[PDB]
Amino acid sequence: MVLSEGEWQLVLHVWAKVEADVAGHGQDILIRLFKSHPETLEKHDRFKHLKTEAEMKASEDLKKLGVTVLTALGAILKKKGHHEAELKPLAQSHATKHKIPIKYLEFISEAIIHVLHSRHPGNFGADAQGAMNKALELFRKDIAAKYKELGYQG
Numbered sequence: 159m160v161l162s163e164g165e166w167q168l169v170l171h172v173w174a175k176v177e178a179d180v181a182g183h184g185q186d187i188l189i190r191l192f193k194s195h196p197e198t199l200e201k202h203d204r205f206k207h208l209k210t211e212a213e214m215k216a217s218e219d220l221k222k223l224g225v226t227v228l229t230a231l232g233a234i235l236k237k238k239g240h241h242e243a244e245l246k247p248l249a250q251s252h253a254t255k256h257k258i259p260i261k262y263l264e265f266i267s268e269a270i271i272h273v274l275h276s277r278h279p280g281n282f283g284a285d286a287q288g289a290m291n292k293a294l295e296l297f298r299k300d301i302a303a304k305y306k307e308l309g310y311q312g
């Protein structure tokens with residue numbers, strides 16, 4: 159798939175707001191993911207023991223992971239589709255080391271959309287959400303193709 163320049167502008171415009179508080183958005187997104195799909199928490203040997211949302215909010219390790227996730231995703235989005243180089247090491251670690259099924263990438267995509275809709279209603283109307291969804295779908299499709307080449311595809 160290919161996004162138009164107008165769609166990229168909608169995506170990067172809301173992303174600029176997200177970047178005013180990377181740590182806070184990172185926390186919100188991961189907690190939303192863990193609450194909505196607890197099975198994803200099991201993949202994180204580092205956080206598997208957290209029992210409540212309060213414990214999650216207090217974890218400095220989870221906050222650091224959130225910043226790492228958003229910083230990597232932001233670098234990919236800013237490439238506006240020309241992200242092959244950035245995708246390779248990410249696909250390799252998530253397929254071979256962490257063993258993350260594509261299904262879980264869809265779950266985190268849902269969490270990103272939920273949080274942006276909650277925090278940026280004025281900059282995340284229907285058109286902006288459609289553009290962000292298209293960007294995340296492109297990301298998942300390209301990662302899935304890489305998983306297959308790497309021998310995982312799942």
Ligand code: HEM
Nearest residue numbers: 198201202204226227230231248251252256258262263266
């Ligand atoms: C927007 C999608 C995502 C991005 C950009 C992303 C990015 C990253 C980055 C950059 C790291 C650190 C270096 C590495 O190991 O590659 C990481 C680690 C990891 N990711 Fe992801 N990730 C994503 C989605 C997921 C999902 C959905 C899961 C699990 C349900 C996941 C599980 C992990 C695990 C287990 C680690 C290691 C965490 C640790 O250090 O203990 N990732 N991810």
